[PDB]
Amino acid sequence: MFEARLVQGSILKKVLEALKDLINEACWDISSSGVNLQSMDSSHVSLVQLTLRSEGFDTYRCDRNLAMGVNLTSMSKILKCAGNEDIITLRAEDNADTLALVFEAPNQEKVSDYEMKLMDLDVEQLGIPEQEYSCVVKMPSGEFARICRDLSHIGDAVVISCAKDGVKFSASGELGNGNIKLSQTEAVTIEMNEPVQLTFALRYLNFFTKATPLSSTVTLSMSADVPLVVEYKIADMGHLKYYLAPKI
Amino acid sequence: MFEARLVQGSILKKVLEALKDLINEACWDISSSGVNLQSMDSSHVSLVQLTLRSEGFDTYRCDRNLAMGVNLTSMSKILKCAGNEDIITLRAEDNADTLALVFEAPNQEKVSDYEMKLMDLDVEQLGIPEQEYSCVVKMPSGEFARICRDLSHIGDAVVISCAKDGVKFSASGELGNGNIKLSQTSEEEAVTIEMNEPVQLTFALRYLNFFTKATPLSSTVTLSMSADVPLVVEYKIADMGHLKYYLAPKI
Amino acid sequence: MFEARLVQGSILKKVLEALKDLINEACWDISSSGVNLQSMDSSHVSLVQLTLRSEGFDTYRCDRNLAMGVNLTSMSKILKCAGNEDIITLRAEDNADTLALVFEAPNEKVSDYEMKLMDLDVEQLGIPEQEYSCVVKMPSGEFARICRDLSHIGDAVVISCAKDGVKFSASGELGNGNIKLSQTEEEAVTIEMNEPVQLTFALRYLNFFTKATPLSSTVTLSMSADVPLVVEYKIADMGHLKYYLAPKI
Amino acid sequence: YNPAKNNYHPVEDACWKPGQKVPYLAVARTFEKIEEVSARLRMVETLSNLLRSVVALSPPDLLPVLYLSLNHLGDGVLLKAVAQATGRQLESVRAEAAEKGDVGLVAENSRSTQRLMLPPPPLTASGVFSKFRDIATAKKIDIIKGLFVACRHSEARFIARSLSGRLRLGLAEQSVLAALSQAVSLTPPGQEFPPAMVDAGKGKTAEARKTWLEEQGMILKQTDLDRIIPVLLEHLPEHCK
Numbered sequence: 001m002f003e004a005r006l007v008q009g010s011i012l013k014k015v016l017e018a019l020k021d022l023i024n025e026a027c028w029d030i031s032s033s034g035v036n037l038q039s040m041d042s043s044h045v046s047l048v049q050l051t052l053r054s055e056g057f058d059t060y061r062c063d064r065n066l067a068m069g070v071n072l073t074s075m076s077k078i079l080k081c082a083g084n085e086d087i088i089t090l091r092a093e094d095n096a097d098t099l100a101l102v103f104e105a106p107n108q109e110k111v112s113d114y115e116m117k118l119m120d121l122d123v124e125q126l127g128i129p130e131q132e133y134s135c136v137v138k139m140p141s142g143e144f145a146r147i148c149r150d151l152s153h154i155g156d157a158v159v160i161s162c163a164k165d166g167v168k169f170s171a172s173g174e175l176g177n178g179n180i181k182l183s184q185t186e187a188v189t190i191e192m193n194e195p196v197q198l199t200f201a202l203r204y205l206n207f208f209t210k211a212t213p214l215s216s217t218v219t220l221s222m223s224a225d226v227p228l229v230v231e232y233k234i235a236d237m238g239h240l241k242y243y244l245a246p247k248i
Numbered sequence: 249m250f251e252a253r254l255v256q257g258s259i260l261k262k263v264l265e266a267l268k269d270l271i272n273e274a275c276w277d278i279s280s281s282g283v284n285l286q287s288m289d290s291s292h293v294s295l296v297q298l299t300l301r302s303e304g305f306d307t308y309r310c311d312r313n314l315a316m317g318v319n320l321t322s323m324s325k326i327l328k329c330a331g332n333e334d335i336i337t338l339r340a341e342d343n344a345d346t347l348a349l350v351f352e353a354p355n356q357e358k359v360s361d362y363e364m365k366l367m368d369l370d371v372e373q374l375g376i377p378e379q380e381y382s383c384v385v386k387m388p389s390g391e392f393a394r395i396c397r398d399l400s401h402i403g404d405a406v407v408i409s410c411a412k413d414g415v416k417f418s419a420s421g422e423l424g425n426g427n428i429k430l431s432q433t434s435e436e437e438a439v440t441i442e443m444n445e446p447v448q449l450t451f452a453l454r455y456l457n458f459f460t461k462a463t464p465l466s467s468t469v470t471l472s473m474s475a476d477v478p479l480v481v482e483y484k485i486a487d488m489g490h491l492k493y494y495l496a497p498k499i
Numbered sequence: 500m501f502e503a504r505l506v507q508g509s510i511l512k513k514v515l516e517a518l519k520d521l522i523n524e525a526c527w528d529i530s531s532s533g534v535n536l537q538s539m540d541s542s543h544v545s546l547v548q549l550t551l552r553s554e555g556f557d558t559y560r561c562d563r564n565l566a567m568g569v570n571l572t573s574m575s576k577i578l579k580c581a582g583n584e585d586i587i588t589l590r591a592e593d594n595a596d597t598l599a600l601v602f603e604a605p606n607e608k609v610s611d612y613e614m615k616l617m618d619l620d621v622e623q624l625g626i627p628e629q630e631y632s633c634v635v636k637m638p639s640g641e642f643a644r645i646c647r648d649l650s651h652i653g654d655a656v657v658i659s660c661a662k663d664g665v666k667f668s669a670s671g672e673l674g675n676g677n678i679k680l681s682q683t684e685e686e687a688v689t690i691e692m693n694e695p696v697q698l699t700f701a702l703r704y705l706n707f708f709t710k711a712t713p714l715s716s717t718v719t720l721s722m723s724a725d726v727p728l729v730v731e732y733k734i735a736d737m738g739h740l741k742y743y744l745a746p747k748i
Numbered sequence: 749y750n751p752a753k754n755n756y757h758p759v760e761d762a763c764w765k766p767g768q769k770v771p772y773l774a775v776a777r778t779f780e781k782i783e784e785v786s787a788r789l790r791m792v793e794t795l796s797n798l799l800r801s802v803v804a805l806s807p808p809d810l811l812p813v814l815y816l817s818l819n820h821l822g823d824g825v826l827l828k829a830v831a832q833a834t835g836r837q838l839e840s841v842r843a844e845a846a847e848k849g850d851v852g853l854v855a856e857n858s859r860s861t862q863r864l865m866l867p868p869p870p871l872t873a874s875g876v877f878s879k880f881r882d883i884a885t886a887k888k889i890d891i892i893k894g895l896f897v898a899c900r901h902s903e904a905r906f907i908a909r910s911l912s913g914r915l916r917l918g919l920a921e922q923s924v925l926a927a928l929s930q931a932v933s934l935t936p937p938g939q940e941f942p943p944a945m946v947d948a949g950k951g952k953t954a955e956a957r958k959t960w961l962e963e964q965g966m967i968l969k970q971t972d973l974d975r976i977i978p979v980l981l982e983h984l985p986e987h988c989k
Contacts, residue, residue, distance in 0.1 A: 081398045114426045150580035175573040178612035201835040248863045322673040329648035362676030
């Protein structure tokens, strides 16, 4: 029998709202260390990598290793019942294919419960490519959100680059072209080994950036001819990564 | 000759805003006691009754028991233009088939007024027999609206259950199953129930979601029903009168 | 070698949003004295006038008279990407078909966009000035409310003036009604009278002209017997926005 | 994989192992090689090399590959599915679809531009043809997204042309029926592996080979192909009537 208890119902809501539009069906791995999600998108262009480690959970129990999946749209539909400060309880059975959510108000007068249905899948997986990166930047979340939401009205691709002066996003389109530069300093910081050029599709960056309210900051780290990472660190419970394959 | 005035002019905006979605034609019956309005739904599934006491109006005078009928959506749109703080005056002649509405701003710097087309309506009357109930519920209107919205995402009908400890709102559907339990709280955020036997009924959740459009009329709803008889939801508007929506139990 | 800088990007955004649908194409009259724009609407019912006095620009640099052409929809789409408190500057070279709009943060972030021009040979028609017989100056919020309210009853409004107050009146299929105003700090109407007038107007185009209310606390309505209405908006020291509309017969 | 070489061999020039399902990449590569040669006889010889290789490795696989070749079982749905499966934006790629050629050249160029993730499993002709019969709105865009992502090098153009119902490869049903007639003539069915026959016309003169092929083609045209093909591989003028 699996159980998880959390006081921060806001973060569970924010995570599902960051995923509900990018992935329809997803496989969870549940272990003593925490819950894992490691899913592909339908077009097989972006890799979503998630980690919620148990030490930040207010209560946790995993007697049996479990590897359930569920459809994210119907879980997002059920989760809009919870109030912003509600206590969230997750529980499941190791034999049956069902997930029970019970929503507890901050004050104890009302309690809600919800049986979501479940199924088993063995979605294809690919391992984390651990590597060094020549390029890495730390910049605040809202600036990257502004940048993607702005460039998405001009062009179709973002041509990222980095220089001894700072970073530069650039995009071109039917109405015009533009670039945006940030100089090296809530601040921007860069560790830089050698300049590089890439190209990326804004559609997936718009999809990723819905995670904005999870963390005040983001890390873009990358290298030549390999996927770029977009990292959001959750407050003292885990992290969320996205990957996007470079165009050529 | 008939005339009326109200200083709290927003409540008429509210009572028409709740009703525009439920019915389209109605009889405004008028008499020495005050305003009376009874009707049936566009699908004959719900009964509405509305009354306003003349002693709640700031100025009133009635010399004949008029009857008149008006297109309800038109009167909801005419009233939508008025400002939420303004003063309402309602005037009508006994012979002339026309309504007169005035919208007085609080500082009298702008005067709004409008006149609307009556039509002769043959809508029947079905005076509800009066009785006791097995249970009565008082609870916050904003919470009932929340739970009735929240169930609407699961499935198309609610079964509503009562027990000595409280009440159970229960729904099945394609996505799953759920129920919500409420119990007594030890003036506007305190629920209360009184009961003489536990009860278990079912209702069409769409009609409750239409009924809860009136949540800004009062802090407290009154939910009440008995064995196989219509569900009555009642709202006490501020000292003026009462609004109640009826729904016979689905089978 | 044209250079212009403005420290209140909210003005440039607001004026460009006031034109986003009413006008498709326009030409800018860049000259040593500032920026000007006259144009007519998509259905040829209503003229607009925009004036941008060179004194309203914190650094201005022009060399020769220049007309330029850009589609307001695309320029608006770029401008919806600027921050509402950024410094904005416009740059172009007198020979090239490309306009540079550079935005700067209040503190590190430089963002610039290049908009491709297009050539035009458009005609500009002004309008003669004359001493209007009845003028009203009244709060912009009350004007937007009245034009939204009466449009729910019918596409026709009639207006008349009286010794104490101007009256806005309408009638429709479902009923009729009117709003009285009376002479009475910014919240106060002022009316001046010369002779009584009674004219009818189209609600739709008044709604379309009313999209610029956040430019000015108050507005001026200029009307008279048998002549086009003028709706007047004055920006803080920068210049004015004006709209014209003739009555129905 | 190419069949355009002079004296090409249906045995040693095959693109797949015996007992492996037929890949669509060789089919697409053939369709573009045919589009590059205007000669109807050189096209027919190319199709005869394909069909001869198909009967040599996968005798059951002939009905699908012929049905695809004859296209026997809207543009906005196609463009929507291409946009949904290839990234960018439906409105932005719709500008790219103007002034250029057919949607297939936008589709293949996009699948060329994104370096993509890992290579998916290659589409087999039986899988493709089975998917098309199920394809004849949300169901449609989902399955068409699965076709487009799987495209390995250049197949996207011929997939799009197949969905548009306007393949226009330069041949017709009777041309491929004759291509099958010389295919079955140069390599008869019912062989025991390894097939000792690879070119039955060896030692016939040019006129004798032309007359023999035309007489074999005359038996095919006179004889629904869904019962013609299983009878042809199992054995004809008496077996069908």
